[PDB]
Amino acid sequence: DIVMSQSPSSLAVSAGEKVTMSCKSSQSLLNSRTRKNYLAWYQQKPGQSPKLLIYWASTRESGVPDRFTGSGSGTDFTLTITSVQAEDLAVYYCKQSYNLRTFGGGTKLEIKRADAAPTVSIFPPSSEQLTSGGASVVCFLNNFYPKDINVKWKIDGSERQNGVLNSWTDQDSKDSTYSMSSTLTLTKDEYERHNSYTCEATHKTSTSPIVKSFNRNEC
Amino acid sequence: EVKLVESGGGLVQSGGSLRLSCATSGFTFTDYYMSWVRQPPGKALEWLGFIRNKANGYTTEYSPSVKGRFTISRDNSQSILYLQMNTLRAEDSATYYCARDHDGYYERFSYWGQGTLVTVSAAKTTPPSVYPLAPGSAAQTNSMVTLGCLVKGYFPEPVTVTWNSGSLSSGVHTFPAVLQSDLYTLSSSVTVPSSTWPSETVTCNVAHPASSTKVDKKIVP
Numbered sequence: 001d002i003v004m005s006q007s008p009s010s011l012a013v014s015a016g017e018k019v020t021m022s023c024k025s026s027q028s029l030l031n032s033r034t035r036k037n038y039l040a041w042y043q044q045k046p047g048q049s050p051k052l053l054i055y056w057a058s059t060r061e062s063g064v065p066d067r068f069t070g071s072g073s074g075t076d077f078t079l080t081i082t083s084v085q086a087e088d089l090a091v092y093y094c095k096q097s098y099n100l101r102t103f104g105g106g107t108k109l110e111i112k113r114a115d116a117a118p119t120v121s122i123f124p125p126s127s128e129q130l131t132s133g134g135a136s137v138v139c140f141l142n143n144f145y146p147k148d149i150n151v152k153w154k155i156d157g158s159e160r161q162n163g164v165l166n167s168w169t170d171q172d173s174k175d176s177t178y179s180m181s182s183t184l185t186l187t188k189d190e191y192e193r194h195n196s197y198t199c200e201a202t203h204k205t206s207t208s209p210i211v212k213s214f215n216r217n218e219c
Numbered sequence: 220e221v222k223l224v225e226s227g228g229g230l231v232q233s234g235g236s237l238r239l240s241c242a243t244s245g246f247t248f249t250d251y252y253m254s255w256v257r258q259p260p261g262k263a264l265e266w267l268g269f270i271r272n273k274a275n276g277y278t279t280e281y282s283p284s285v286k287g288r289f290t291i292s293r294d295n296s297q298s299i300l301y302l303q304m305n306t307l308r309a310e311d312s313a314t315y316y317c318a319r320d321h322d323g324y325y326e327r328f329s330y331w332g333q334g335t336l337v338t339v340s341a342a343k344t345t346p347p348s349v350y351p352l353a354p355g356s357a358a359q360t361n362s363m364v365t366l367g368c369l370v371k372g373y374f375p376e377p378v379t380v381t382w383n384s385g386s387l388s389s390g391v392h393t394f395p396a397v398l399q400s401d402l403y404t405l406s407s408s409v410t411v412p413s414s415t416w417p418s419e420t421v422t423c424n425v426a427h428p429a430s431s432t433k434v435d436k437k438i439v440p
């Protein structure tokens with residue numbers, strides 16, 4: 001029963017700005033015998049294993065840049081990132097080793113950046129999938145900011161809402177953009193009744209949709 | 220290289236047992252405490268337990284969440300760490316990492332492994348269908364063409380997707396799997412110079428370790 005908790009849950013900071021985040025302990029982490037605060041901070045970039053950044057509250061793991069600064073004592077700790085980089089996109093965790101080990105809930109750091117329009121691309125069903133009796137139309141909406149984006153699917157000039165799967169990537173560690181995948185799944189017989197297939201993306205970057213289309217009799 | 224490498228993950232049924240292993244090399248194993256940490260998808264890190272070093276007689280300590288159900292052991296002949304997990308339930312579906320822990324003064328986790336994913340489900344192993352995504356009919360005038368692979372209808376997670384066996388690393392977006400009616404589906408795009416495709420061949424390599432599936436799908440016009 002040492003409860004670890006972090007603040008905030010998430011935030012977004014532009015590159016070159018300062019980040020500060022907090023970590024609480026339900027009981028002091030100061031060892032009276034060794035006089036260290038047994039509190040570590042870890043960085044888990046998207047898709048990766050956690051990496052140690054700081055230990056004993058304020059000692060930098062070697063290799064770790066001087067723009068990461070751990071501070072605090074007792075029950076209250078702070079990680080500060082100065083001149084934040086695009087690659088600092090990660091979830092940050094504090095961890096006590098004063099009595100066994102316990103992780104806090106984590107702080108998710110978004111990077112704020114300038115609005116970008118998506119590159120939209122549409123893909124007809126492959127012949128190998130059709131031969132099985134189904135048909136997936138895929139639409140990629142790549143390298144856009146902010147994450148908020150709408151996708152409408154249109155068959156023969158008409159909207160279709162059933163059978164859509166969407167998936168957003170985690171933010172990009174280098175250019176801070178998002179990407180998204182939209183997949184429409186029909187049967188082959190459903191697919192072969194209609195001619196026009198349209199992926200329509202509305203993003204805040206323009207007042208007209210980005211529209212990618214293909215015609216099935218052109219296949 | 221100090222290296223740590225977990226194995227033994229895969230699908231298991233509610234109530235079942237499963238043992239995980241963690242291969243170590245590149246450091247003096249007996250000198251180190253060794254920990255298991257878990258992470259449900261999209262969730263927080265959770266410490267499970269450790270086994271102490273030789274100086275501390277290889278004693279174990281467990282978190283209350285697993286104490287009585289999980290067992291940690293080590294093989295000092297071969298520098299291998301183990302996690303026995305019994306009476307598994309849905310909550311235990313997670314990535315399990317082994318971490319190189321304490322050495323007597325030093326208080327940190329400097330080395331973790333890549334993780335092994337455990338899925339606790341009544342659902343059946345189902346391999347993916349891999350479908351190429353070649354453009355239909357547009358001007359490819361961009362200087363940049365985007366291609367794809369669709370990895371559809373598999374269980375359990377994970378899959379791995381590379382392009383040209385890792386040679387194409389830049390401009391790849393692999394999109395997190397989405398669960399719809401007990402099967403996963405994901406996709407991955409690659410953006411190469413239109414100069415380079417179709418004239419240079421582009422292949423997605425896909426694996427689904429749960430079914431020992433290995434696919435090399437060439438993207439053909």
Ligand SMILES: C=CCO[C@]1(C(=O)O)C[C@@H](O)[C@@H](O)[C@@H]([C@@H](O)CO)O1
Binds near residue numbers: 031038099275321326
């Ligand atoms: C003489 C062994 C005591 O060290 C430990 C422990 O083994 O419980 C491990 C340390 O990482 C640390 O958690 C410590 C605590 O007593 C507080 O330092 O206990």
